[model samples]
Target: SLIRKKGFYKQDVNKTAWELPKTYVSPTHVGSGAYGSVCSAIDKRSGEKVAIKKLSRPFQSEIFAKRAYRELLLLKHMQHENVIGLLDVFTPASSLRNFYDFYLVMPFMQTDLQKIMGMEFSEEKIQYLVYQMLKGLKYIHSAGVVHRDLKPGNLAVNEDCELKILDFGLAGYVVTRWYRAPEVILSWMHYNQTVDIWSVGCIMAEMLTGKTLFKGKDYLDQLTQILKVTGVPGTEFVQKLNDKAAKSYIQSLPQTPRKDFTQLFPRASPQAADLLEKMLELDVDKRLTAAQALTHPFFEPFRDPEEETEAQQPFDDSLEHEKLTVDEWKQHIYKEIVNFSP
Candidate 1:
């Protein structure tokens, strides 16, 4: 009977649209998580390595379902080379209409930025890597998106220094709390793209110092770490949060002068330290935008956009894709599956 079960498994059909194609390798299970498992699979068509994400119960939990929709929708439209591109999507079954699992295919890389997190990198290496992060974020922000969970683990890299951002599931809410912006922690609910800028600063600092800039054990501890470095938020910063209790609470803390950025990163150039200072500013409104960070004097030597390949093929320039409802997102995805052969 167990062997017979294998026979039934072999007779494949598109549940609604996609039956996992024979065009890719039978993925070797590499990892698994709350969403589902990920694996390394070879593209029988292109003969290259790619990542396949199997999402469990895509329509079940609100968090899982919403993330599935957003990840699919965003990747379909946002195509900067620095951002991971969706290679294909599918579900295994005869009736795709009621599928529970979701599978997405994407390009693969040798490693993630996690590899370089704590290493003492050269100046050229650090600037090139961090600049790619900002350049990519600039385009994502311009597309009206925020990569709320931008950490080393969420980045892909190659020996040649090509970088691509991954993991968009936790784009909002309280993700990446260690690098969390003060405005977000203070419940300044209107926080936007600036939140991502804060994370970028933390990442840059990590590359230099070989440790997380803020190593908070928890959310409150997080605030404590930021305060230790940048000092407490000013009355001007707190008053604008529009919460009297929050303002009073922040003001109650001892006012501290800003830490010298050069002191924190003594080996870093003055220009680099200056940029980091502005980026880590407690005032959310004052943080540099991704595009602005590109023009900073720190990146001056690398400012010529034409010299770098990072500036090209971000994907189709069509920000014109129609906005759809919850059900429509599901429909749109299924439609993509039905139309996909590879």
Candidate 2:
């Protein structure tokens, strides 16, 4: 009964083999996505559960490898209460040449925000959740990093309502259409971190209403949905659009008045609607930053200056644009794993 295996443990799921250290046991397949499969396992040594993501064919292409490397780099650098960071990294392969499978370990989260949409929440609870999101965003933004893929699915939550934002690999990429900001959809000059605030606004609205705020068919239709709620922007705002096609299309649409936030969110407090309006501003310049949103009246009850912290230094994103081959990225990723103690 005391007998135990001393070496690696082998398991298979989705026709993919997993070779993990003996310290990690009972691998249970949790979910799968474009990146790869995730399994929840117990760390026997510490008696803690962890989610290990086996990235599929990380070196299959330059793009895939770069994403893998980027996620690792960002996750490693970020250390926040509300942000998911890497706990460990490993590979079963023998050498760089044979390093086909890559693994990223992180603390296991019971569920993500998307799964909890139908659950009813009190106004105080809603404010607390939104406060934590903005708090996390403040830390991320202060580090010169934007969570480009801020969506309900990317926000992990647990029974106690603790939240941690994950998935840092898709920076500067097309955000999920439903949560995308107007400036990003319209291509109205270069967008900035404020784009994330718009996404947060969409998420808050969804949580309050128990449904997706703006579900659109496509890119053009996405813009149409956003315009209907925020209303057709003024001509002065329209002139800022650099794209002639987009400008022409917007001009052709019949004028629509901005929907009253209080009326739209009847269940939410007036202060809640006010903060939402500030976040979902049609103009990028007018949108609230994560920091500003934290100071809003809606979050007054939960705001704590001491606990709302910023990152010590900005996250360096220069490497994101650097061109590198799979082999080059593999080398970097390998070093990161090897250097990691646990």
Candidate 3:
């Protein structure tokens, strides 16, 4: 009865491995990242392509364990058209003692914005994509979570032009430096979802041109590149800095002049450049929130107030603060996996 009713499958591909349910078939390695590797498979019941991520050694350390728990929790809680949704969670281990492998299943997107970077995107298509991003960010921020890893490579896009945000898990060592906001780079005292807004600004700029806007060589280089375009901050903004080193450092750097967005992106419409300027502000205080970005003139063509929904309740993230042992984290994650279904 067990074999007939519930079966399991295994795959050894590339440097990654996966042990998932028999419900998923035709497993093929898709890609690898800092956290884990991904595989594309066909769901037997639904006959739809699904991407399965194998989180390797989640219990190896408290940090990885917490990230695993947090990613699982956020994916399980978030359900929106423009955000990645958790379809299933599974493990082939017989008991907690053997529960080492973890799998997260999601709908497969054929391509991502990273792959489409070189191509020419019509203004209409760019507007639609940006609108979807803001809408997704609105829901995520309303739920009290910030997607620290917002980047073009993390954005999933379909052949039909449908875009969805991906990769909720935080990195252990380094995040993609290109899309990082100025506040994060400068080590600001407090930051909010506006960091994600800065990413949107960078992405929109990339979409406008077929090149990365800030091609920084390193951390210091990143800030320099950002300031080259946005211009150096004035005394009013620098006085608010909580980090003494950051404040002093900013005061030390040469005052770079801000470039006019319209002149920089000659092809962009006035509305597009206007919106971009708002999102790319060096001052977090002045950056546009996701909700406000949705109302910009650039998105007027696709704005639908009724459809732009916020999370009904903010996500309860008290678990993130607790310092739990590996065993304790295993139990919590195990329970969440067992309780979840596609």
Candidate 4:
């Protein structure tokens, strides 16, 4: 069972460098993204290694600063083995152009799921990976959080095969594409954490096949693949689409035929095939929750003896190590942005 930790509070909002404990080292760049770069560093006090994500979007307005603050607040309270833990935060003083900036300290992971997918692993190993993903999602949902941007790049695995979900920058109370539920796909605003379950299905399929199952190059192509696999949207879903008027072109197209994984990936096991179907199903109501997915038959054959022992083990302390501060995190981001600018 997943446990939710409560009473987590936001860090003091108005603290400056000299006011709070300054314990982070200069950040070394590790990865980059649309908003900024992630860097590796260490906390001088605890001597723990950590990763810091620096935001690059200019803090030109109070709104943007508030959003960044909210992200920190939300991440600070999120604690789970599979989810990256936030240890500390650092922001610039208001006197410095009144711009808001911060560094989010988390465990340093060597590689993400995307890199792992490129390597050849046994089916059982892949199944274990899937199980870890479910555990992460289970923890997130238990905390009333939804990982809006769940993808191969957002998931990390350590040397011990302990998978951790990363990057909650885009995560919020709202639904998002990629991991979006079918109802949310049809513009349903009341979607739940099950959205991550849908993404897990897509990711697991990609990991097994080493290719995107729904690689639609464009909107039509994407919709075509979705409709083909899950069948056309139902009446209620279609009604929302009709009102949107943005999908008229898609509505004009012929209905796509239902698809089965056996026809798609004949070499896949029955358990794998069934799991894929459930994950990609068009009906949001029938989608599996993270907890429910843990009991999936797909995992039955792949359960390992060591997993039972590991499951009973307490949360690993190795994950609690610290990393870089805000200034160093931004420097790392600046270098990456310069590299990608052309």
Q: Considering TM-score, where higher is better, how would the candidates rank from best to worst?
A: 2, 3, 1, 4
CA-RMSD of model 4 = 11.7
Predicted candidate 4 versus true structure: per-residue lDDT over 106-138, tens digit per residue: 788888887877677667877888988887777
Which residue pairs in candidate 3 collide? none
What residue pairs are clashing in model 2?
none
What would the TM-score be for candidate 1 when compared with the true structure?
A: 0.82
Superposed Cα deviation of residue 37, candidate 4 (Å): 3.2
Whole-model Cα lDDT of every candidate shown, in order? 0.71, 0.84, 0.85, 0.62
State in Å the error of residue 260, model 1.
1.7
User: Which candidate comes out best when scored by lDDT?
Assistant: 3
The true-versus-predicted C-alpha distance at residue 323 of model 3, in Å, is 2.0
Number of the top candidate by TM-score? 2
- Per-residue lDDT tens digits for candidate 2, residues 1-342, read 212224756778656788787888988999999988999999988899999999988899999998888888788878888989888888876677677767889989999888988789787888988898888889888888888768888899988999999885365254457887777766766788888999999998988888888976667778878887898888777877788887888788898889799998888899989988898888777789998889899999989988789989888766788898888889988887888764
User: Could you tell me which residue pairs clash in candidate 4?
Assistant: none
List, residue by residue over 253-316, the lDDT tens digit for candidate 3: 8877676989888989999899988998877888899999998999888999987899898888
Model 3 / residue 261 / CA error / Å: 1.5
